[PDB]
A paper describes a structure:
The spike (S) glycoprotein of SARS-CoV-2 mediates receptor recognition and viral entry into cells. It forms homotrimers protruding from the virus surface and, once engaged with the host-cell receptor–human ACE2, undergoes a substantial structural rearrangement to fuse the viral membrane with the host-cell membrane. The S protein is also the primary target of the humoral immune response during infection. A large number of SARS-CoV-2 neutralizing monoclonal antibodies bind S protein, especially its receptor-binding domain (RBD), providing a basis for vaccine development.
Numbering used by the authors:
A (entry chain D): 310 to 457
B (entry chain B): 409 to 507
C (entry chain D): 508 to 620, 641 to 676, 689 to 704
D (entry chain A): 14 to 69, 77 to 247, 255 to 309
E (entry chain A): 951 to 1000
Write the structure that this text describes.
Amino acid sequence: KGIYQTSNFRVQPTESIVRFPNITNLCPFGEVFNATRFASVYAWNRKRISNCVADYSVLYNSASFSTFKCYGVSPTKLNDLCFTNVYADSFVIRGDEVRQIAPGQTGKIADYNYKLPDDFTGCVIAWNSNNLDSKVGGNYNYRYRLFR
Amino acid sequence: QIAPGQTGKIADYNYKLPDDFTGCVIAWNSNNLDSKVGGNYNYRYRLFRKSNLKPFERDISTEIYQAGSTPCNGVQGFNCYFPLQSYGFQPTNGVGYQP
Amino acid sequence: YRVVVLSFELLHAPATVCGPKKSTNLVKNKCVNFNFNGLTGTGVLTESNKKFLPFQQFGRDIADTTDAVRDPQTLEILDITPCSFGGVSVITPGTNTSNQVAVLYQGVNCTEVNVFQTRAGCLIGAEHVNNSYECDIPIGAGICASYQTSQSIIAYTMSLGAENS
Amino acid sequence: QCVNLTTRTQLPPAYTNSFTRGVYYPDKVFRSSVLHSTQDLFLPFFSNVTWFHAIHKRFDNPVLPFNDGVYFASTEKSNIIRGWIFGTTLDSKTQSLLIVNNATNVVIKVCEFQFCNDPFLGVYYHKNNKSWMKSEFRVYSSANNCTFEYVSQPFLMDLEGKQGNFKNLREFVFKNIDGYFKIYSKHTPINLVRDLPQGFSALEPLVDLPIGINITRFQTLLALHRSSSGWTAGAAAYYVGYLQPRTFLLKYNENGTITDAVDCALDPLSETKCTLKSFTVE
Amino acid sequence: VVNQNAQALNTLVKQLSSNFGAISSVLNDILSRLDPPEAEVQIDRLITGR
């Protein structure tokens, strides 16, 4: 006969709460590919993107790209990874020339124009410009280096 | 990648030992036998999986791994890959690629 | 085909560009596990009258334990109250007398759960009697329990003895 | 670029005493009605600081070592302080940092900079139409290989000269920890003659730069004017100090602000306070 | 009696922030970084000291 403490009761959490700041003040990645004119394969511009937040789900789920592929990193894992420097290359190349863009590739455009190192961790994006760049009579503004 | 606490394409997909596992791991070079011409398809493995496999478990499900929203319908395609894969075996492979 | 090549390079310099955020709904006056920025824990979120410095997001007590936090998105002062916890006390007579049992909680009102409340906490399985008798089973806050009269466990105020003038 | 000021005169680095200066909020932790003890790089109380000034026959823009951290205090009228130069070799051979205020935005960049022997900014033709607009840039000749850029929000800075007591006071703290530059700022008006006034002020966070470079030396940018070796300087005084790993007792009030600080090592009295973790010695 | 109890309670609580040889005093931090077999080594130091 008496009072005995058999245990200590503890209330468990019902649900988990999540709170963070806004997504505001991003880098306009959409404007990179949205730019009216792009540099030539030899003239390709290099843009330095830093100090912002990047949302890659809009580019993958927009269905606005002809071909999308990555090397060394999966597209779903980019959202959970923080990068110090992001360089977005811009240029125009032939359709059959897109296959030469990759780590340790060959060909005219790869060796004499633009090449990807074997350790390149980035991604590739391309879409058909025939509705913009190509015009009646031909457009010679975009050139390339044939010999080196 | 086969050992208590170790992770990788083996421990996380097909074959996993528990962290408390007590046993002996033995290995030897069969390259002079198992390697046949360009490859041996009798030994396969699960390349892709949607979650992590627990230790002391064997999952024979061949269901197509679907990373996207498009239904795979049991065939390869965009964001659809066949998880079961075969180890390439050749007599000329390097010590890292030898069976 | 217009091609955009993104070069991902991780150098010794600090990292800035990161993926998107979530910022789910907020809940208050309930036990939940909350994670704010790089801080995690379990407690009850309640808005208080305290005012944090605009440049100080998180607070701490003398024990270095944060009692309140500021919403990383909205500007508010939310006090962090730990979830209800306490010891489980079982007041029952000896096996020879009866098997009746009365559960008692310490430092908490009646939540989980003849449900009565006392100064020591929630007391279930007992009856409150105004007549004060000699103490039998000590509880607390000047309250004792005993098994009496069709008999059950009752909760009465501990008596100091008969009055003598 | 390679030209040096003619009016600039060399002088010995006279020293002065600081009272409580060098106290700042260590972190973002909020605390009230408690007494906290922490160790970090601080300016000891009753220590000796350096005495520099700028005027139309002595002008001081010396080089000083950054070491782990430093404390800066300057009394301003026209806001003659234009910024600071941070770098290891102070040349294009490495990456140097420049914190500058153009009167519109705060420009902060990390590039390969061409170093000038005596960088400054001149301002010409005040007279009527008071002007006070930047013209010549002697900070750097050229820049490239930029890994960082930052620009603050637009603002209007008043560069007009004033007379009498100094109406502006800027006390900053510069340090580098784990490749993170920390800047703490405080601005309050004072009535001062020379040296430093006796009082207490708590500095607040301004910006955080994850640049992650080593700075062994620094300079103090100043503005010159004349009605490029013949420019003149206005009357001003600024100070520099060296931070040391000292422990202070920061007394938090009900609102959360620091009421006063106590250095654990000053005299045998203060040591008793950190021993008891209280400001009342029985 | 009140001061002696306050020092004992305040002391007992402040020891939770101590590392006790562990990498960090927070339990979820060690579990969220080291592998299961490596974490137990560090968690034991906290349990031992605490």
